[PDB]
Design a binder for this molecule. Structure first.
Ligand SMILES: NC(=O)C1=CN([C@@H]2O[C@H](COP(=O)(O)OP(=O)(O)OC[C@H]3O[C@@H](n4cnc5c(N)ncnc54)[C@H](OP(=O)(O)O)[C@@H]3O)[C@@H](O)[C@H]2O)C=CC1
Ligand SMILES: O=[P-]([O-])[O-]
Ligand SMILES: O=[P-]([O-])[O-]
Ligand SMILES: [Mn+2]
Ligand SMILES: [Mn+2]
Lengths: 377, 370
């Protein structure tokens, strides 16, 4: 039947692709809510106009000043819209830890949560797990989407390993010597998924973050979650079972596919994306990740094994470190060095967070600690 | 603990199956062995190891040499099946001779772990009529892969099944080059059939019979590494694939243990070292055997038995130095072209035998004229 969808982060990259999917499938989906931050207010108003959804929220009260007929506005608007709207699916495509609370509200309503917001799991960790029930969270990320598909290839008891694929970033195969002179422009650093995104995939912190999320979503121990470099990005991830069989998910890159699947779970959406084409020659290459040169994934596994607020620390330390590198203050290899520095001092943050404020507090501590590492103070 | 009868126990599949069984006594027990009689040493050894005396030997003289074989003669494997209480029949015979033991296995209500693809291709709707849904679990890698990948969705979400083909030893060769191929370069039936691409054609038919999807939604792609064993493409554009280093113990173990996987059955893909999985279209003009299989499959009825039986005769002639390599598929085409009578649905096993008899003679006739 028709699923009722609240789209949080409607004006972002994931949120707009989801509305594409939804417009293309009015049989299967209906938008009943939209929420945005306020920075792209004009897009939200166009979206109100073109979908006819008046049930909309704007996080920034100051930006909400420009409109006058928003039923939900201010710091807790997305949360309140989630609380007050009857829905079957909440797509959380918000950016930053501000996505955490709307995630919790979504879980509490009993609606299915299509999760795009990284920090919900990476920072919110045990808060989100305590609040989620099985099958409630469906991941939007292509790796995690792939994993959920491949897991249909056996029972949980039959899983030997989860293998995430990684593009390798622009410095795939580079020596550590080469990495010493990397500049922001070489590493990426765009009108959409640009800024922080390209930097995390150049540094493989993005993979580290994905490894944590994989553990939290799927329950597989960190020592059985692998990463392989796969430059074409056709195989998005795979699962090795205990008999030696590997099941893999494959498609030409297009976020509309995992997005469509997150929305319609467990039923697939006819024509969401183009299939692989075996009418023409091609190849899928794999190479191991050099973990001496890129220890960002192993760092994440250490933070993840520590647990509690530690992955909040890991991510926050990264965000500060990358900023220092983007600002010319530090060298590229120093990004993961500062992250490790902060993690080594953070033993107090192994406790389980009780509240959102605990997560935010972990985050502030990591930033300050990383800031001191950058400045030598 | 599953009671398993192993037909063709001395062969490549059979010995590997016994090893898997040997390695999991908690799950599997051999209760029967069938063999041709060409490898008595291997057979005696398996008897001593498994302690099974419930044994079928096809060759009368061979069975005589061994002594105390309860089933001997041409129908011995079939009689062993009919009389042995079993949960699983592993049919790892080679050739369309596997047809009767396959039908017998199905009638006993046991699971048919099928390595002998020929019996299904020949039997067609006859074998299907005899089977319960899911009674036939494939041992063939492609089909074992497809079965796993189909867990990726419900049937109405399936867009396409994609079989992988190694391309054989003569992948990339021209028709002209193929004229010179010797039996040594195509080196048993498996090996030759992989080279001629007839094996892929049989697998395309097996795909339609096992999974019930139309021939125009079954694709073939050449993948020379043979790591990806087959894939399913769903209507949303997602493809689910199965992959493992080539080792028949994996699909054997799964066919035996279905729906449960057997830990340690085989080595997994190793991503601690670099590799490349390549794909290219099949050169169908140089290798038309897969297209000939589809034409046979779409005609249906006893036509697929004809396709296989023609090949068996032609392959024998090639291996004997009587014809050239390209003449294998040429003869199949010639025999198929004359096989108008055989589009009828087989109603008994005799219908299938009749079609095969005709096709064999017709293939000898074509060998005569060249
Ligand atoms: N890796 C592989 O080998 C693969 C095999 N397959 C399929 O599995 C099936 C078995 O192939 P494979 O194991 O390679 O073949 P083999 O030639 O290695 O084995 C054939 C077996 O059948 C026995 N046999 C038993 N009864 C008879 C009889 N009445 N007449 C003739 N032979 C008899 C032979 O015994 P004996 O030798 O003692 O006479 C032998 O054990 C084939 O249909 C093949 O297509 C499919 C995929 C991969
Ligand atoms: O590095 P990419 O796979 O996120
Ligand atoms: O060579 P095989 O894939 O038929
Ligand atoms: Mn990703
Ligand atoms: Mn095969």
């Amino acid at each position: 039947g028709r699923l009722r969808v609240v789209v949080l982060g409607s004006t972002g990259s994931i949120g707009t692709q989801a509305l594409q999917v939804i417009a293309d499938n009015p049989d299967r989906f209906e938008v009943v809510g939209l929420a945005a931050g306020g920075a792209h207010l004009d897009t939200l108003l166009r979206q109100r106009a073109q979908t006819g959804v008046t049930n909309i929220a704007v996080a920034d009260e100051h930006a909400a000043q420009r409109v006058g007929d928003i039923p939900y506005h201010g710091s807790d608007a997305a949360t309140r819209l989630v609380e007050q709207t009857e829905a079957d699916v909440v797509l959380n495509a918000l950016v930053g830890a501000l996505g955490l609370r709307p995630t919790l509200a979504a879980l509490k309503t009993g609606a299915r949560l299509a999760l795009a917001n990284k920090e919900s799991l990476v920072a919110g960790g045990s808060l989100v797990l305590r609040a989620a029930r099985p099958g409630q969270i469906v991941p939007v990320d292509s790796e995690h989407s792939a994993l959920a598909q491949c897991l249909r290839g056996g029972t949980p008891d039959e899983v030997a390993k989860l293998v995430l694929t990684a593009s390798g970033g622009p410095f795939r195969g580079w020596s550590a010597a080469d990495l010493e002179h990397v500049t922001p422009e070489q590493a990426g650093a765009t009108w959409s998924m640009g800024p922080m995104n390209t930097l995390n995939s150049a540094s493989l912190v993005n993979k580290g973050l994905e490894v944590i999320e994989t553990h939290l979503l799927f329950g597989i121990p960190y020592d059985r979650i692998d990463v392989v470099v796969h430059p074409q990005s056709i195989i998005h991830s795979m699962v090795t079972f205990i008999d030696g069989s590997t099941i893999a998910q494959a498609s030409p890159p297009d976020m509309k596919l995992p997005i469509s699947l997150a929305l319609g779970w467990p039923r697939r959406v006819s024509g969401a994306a183009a299939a692989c084409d075996f009418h023409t020659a091609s190849s899928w290459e794999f190479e191991p990740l050099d973990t001496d040169v890129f220890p960002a994934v192993e760092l994440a596994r250490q933070a993840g094994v520590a647990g509690g607020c530690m992955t909040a620390v890991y991510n926050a330390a990264n965000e500060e470190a990358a900023a220092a590198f983007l600002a010319g203050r530090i060298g590229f290899p120093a990004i993961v060095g500062i992250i490790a520095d902060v993690l080594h001092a953070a033993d107090q943050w192994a406790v389980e967070p009780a509240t959102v404020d605990d997560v935010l507090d972990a985050q502030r501590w990591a930033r300050e600690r990383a800031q001191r590492a950058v400045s030598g103070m």
